[PDB]
Design a protein around this ligand. Sequence first.
Ligand code: HEM
Ligand code: HEM
Ligand SMILES: O=C(N[C@H](CS[C@H](Cc1ccccc1)C(=O)NCCCc1cccnc1)Cc1cccc2ccccc12)c1cccnc1
Ligand SMILES: O=C(N[C@H](CS[C@H](Cc1ccccc1)C(=O)NCCCc1cccnc1)Cc1cccc2ccccc12)c1cccnc1
Lengths: 429, 429
Amino acid sequence: HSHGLFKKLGIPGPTPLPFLGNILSYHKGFCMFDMECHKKYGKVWGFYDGQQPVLAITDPDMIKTVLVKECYSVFTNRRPFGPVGFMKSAISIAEDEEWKRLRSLLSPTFTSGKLKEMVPIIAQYGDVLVRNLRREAEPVTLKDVFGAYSMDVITSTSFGVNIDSLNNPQDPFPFFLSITVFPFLIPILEVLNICTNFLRKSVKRMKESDFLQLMIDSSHKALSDLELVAQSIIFIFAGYETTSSVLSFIMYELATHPDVQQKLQEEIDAVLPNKAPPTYDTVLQMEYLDMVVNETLRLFPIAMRLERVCKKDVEINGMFIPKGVVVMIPSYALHRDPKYWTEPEKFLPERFSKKNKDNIDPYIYTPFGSGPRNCIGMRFALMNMKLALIRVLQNFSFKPCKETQIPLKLSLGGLLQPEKPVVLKVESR
Amino acid sequence: HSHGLFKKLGIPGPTPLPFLGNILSYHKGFCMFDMECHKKYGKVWGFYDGQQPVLAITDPDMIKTVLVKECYSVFTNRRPFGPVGFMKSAISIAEDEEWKRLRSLLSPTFTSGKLKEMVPIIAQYGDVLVRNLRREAEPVTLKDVFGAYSMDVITSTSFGVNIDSLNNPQDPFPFFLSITVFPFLIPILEVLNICTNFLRKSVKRMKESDFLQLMIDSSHKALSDLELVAQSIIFIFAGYETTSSVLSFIMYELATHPDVQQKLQEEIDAVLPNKAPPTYDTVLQMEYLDMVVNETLRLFPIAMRLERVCKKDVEINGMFIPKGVVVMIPSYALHRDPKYWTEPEKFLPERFSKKNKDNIDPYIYTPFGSGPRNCIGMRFALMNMKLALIRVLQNFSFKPCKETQIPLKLSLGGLLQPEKPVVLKVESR
Ligand code: HEM
Ligand code: HEM
Ligand SMILES: O=C(N[C@H](CS[C@H](Cc1ccccc1)C(=O)NCCCc1cccnc1)Cc1cccc2ccccc12)c1cccnc1
Ligand SMILES: O=C(N[C@H](CS[C@H](Cc1ccccc1)C(=O)NCCCc1cccnc1)Cc1cccc2ccccc12)c1cccnc1
């Protein structure tokens, strides 16, 4: 069918098989597929997820045109996910005009000062972590401890609840993607009644009569109860998973690089002497801390792939793109590209130093994306993580163990998840 | 699911059943449904074809906004038909940018002078009709004789072929619409390989090395062989069916109204004395002839329903419409509306007289639609029909028979087709 598209465009790529397209080459994960295609075909290439044509671009100017220059008019939406039901109205899933409203509706949640009156609330949960951390079983599953914290902070910044997750919490947060081959079955399930339930109303209950309160405020600017919940489901998952997952990845690199973990712990002692309470302005000046979370986001991107659906015919940077093609930016392949990073498989936070910050193109390293559809909780995630990295390193040191996977191997599937959990030996001072 | 839409909009209509919506009320045809809903709910009402919300409008200013004012930006497309395959690129089926190109590509086919150098070719096939008509079996199936002619003229104006259809032609030109209830299965069949074949290449053969020649001319302005054929399939079907079907409907009203058939035959004798050959300018001045084809198009519209898919949220004439709603204009219900026509079930061509032409709103009587997506072959159809009505009435008179359905009843399904064919007794002079 559409498998002759890239042939007619003069665009190279792996020859697709009938119906399946190129999905068979995902047997080592799409990152390995993206990197190998990046080396065999160059700056641009096309392939097929089933019968869906995907155009991969690695040129920075062209990437900037897709994510920024032609976002509103052409590349407004990502690949349509489903079946979801009412979750179609979630901001990270909605399209065009409905998303444009949801973005403007939820933008003021993480402004400059909106995060400033969060630290007094976030700081309290930090101690709860150091208390549950101070346990002396003289490794530790870094994910659960970080997940307990990250759930406690996003459920508190969005709504009013604290949860010492030493006991059981209620947040219940895969291997199913046949649609990517055969997605034409999504409209089948949109009427087959396919989707949350416990949380689909547990959130809905919230009346409180602030993310929750800056929404019940609900002129072409309304918000149903399900809409309230649909945004809450996204914010809770993103605040729990993304934070905790990256925090554990950061700790793995700190344990396997004692010089970096030690030089960072020196940074926290100086700027915050006598283990002073982390404020909103002390985080924003620890420079080496910023480099450490930045270099970890390079080697372990949560996206791995950035994508935009072409909505109408375009010619960008001297190349025509038809409607309905998914334009993909292989962030993982670009973050590991030896053409932009020397020894790219190595953990070296000096890439983001004061002098080396200029050599980085902001359209090759895009851990939060860019443009109007970038990560809306980027600054909340950076602050929530850095507030965590500061207090946990002011008190503890982290060290490998016999139950630690070294070198850490990432699930060769479709998730910035490790094969084995990060279990590090925690030591105290 | 979406069945609560019109309830939340304050818009009345028949309460839908699960999954089916309101399709059950089509048991007397959608025209009866449109007329009865027009009388029970007023100027605007909504219903569901399955789970697809359809908004019916009868206000002329609002109809003008949909068909004309907001065509390019909002109401660019009709209901997506399928499964078709390569026929998706046919102009009457394509969407937005692809249709916008196909319209500009095929517009010059029926200009002012483009039809003027057609009459010398069309006139020859007229005689072929009067020859096959002069047969004296002293009724006649009006459709086959008209269909033989209308196929001979559109296959000649578009490509080079004549066909005395006294013998067998090759044009092979239903009752299947489950999709209207359950259309989510269309993308299933777009990959299940569901569609023409004989004609899918019989047309393709055309090389000729003029509709065919003004296309092989095939910069973002190309046309594949299938595209050539896909447009040819539409032009052939429209030139054969629409012409012959309306011609037979016109003859039925002329046979059942001898005063109108006689007054029209007087009109042809005067303007064209001594049965002078019909030219391009003699057709354009027979005024009563124009009224007769106009009044027949009122009682027997080929559309019955005009529809546009709402592509983005709009507020038109003080009413909000969400994305994805099909806006329907019930042409049949409006053509039979006693509020705009006195005794609307009666055949009275004086409604379109010189003085009575002003009382007609051009957005209540829309047999060819209006706006950028109107009938592109309107003037070719009007000329091709009037050129036929002139010569066939210059020689013959048409009269009811025992094998004639009086009063004629239309298929209560979804087609301007009669229940029984128009079989009239043809007499000569
Ligand atoms: C280390 C932490 C995080 C990373 C690396 C990350 C990464 C990303 C990326 C790559 C995108 C897509 C950008 C694009 O396609 O151009 C995105 C979007 C988004 N992020 Fe995050 N994210 C993080 C944390 C969070 C948090 C804490 C929230 C809290 C609400 C959040 C909410 C969202 C939403 C709602 C979107 C979709 C925005 C839209 O569709 O308009 N993210 N994020
Ligand atoms: C009595 C004869 C005819 C009638 C009553 C008729 C009626 C119509 C109507 C109601 C529409 C839709 C307009 C709208 O939705 O606003 C249409 C569209 C169209 N007609 Fe006809 N038609 C006739 C003959 C023809 C002929 C002879 C052709 C020859 C090519 C033709 C080609 C088309 C095409 C291609 C479209 C689609 C235009 C587009 O999608 O841009 N029609 N017609
Ligand atoms: O993942 C698909 N689309 C997605 C859009 S839906 C997806 C559904 C979902 C809901 C609840 C839990 C888990 C998944 C969704 O809401 N996620 C973002 C919600 C929270 C979050 C996570 C991470 C960074 N910030 C924010 C596009 C998308 C948006 C934002 C961030 C993303 C990060 C990685 C990958 C995709 C991303 C997809 C996959 C296969 C086929 N088609 C579509
Ligand atoms: O009929 C559907 N859509 C249609 C768009 S496809 C339809 C498919 C088809 C191809 C070949 C033979 C018969 C049908 C198509 O090409 N016709 C127009 C082709 C010739 C023609 C006929 C009549 C007046 N002029 C021109 C919308 C549409 C366009 C133009 C004129 C129309 C007249 C009456 C009704 C619909 C019309 C539909 C039905 C159910 C569900 N969804 C969609």
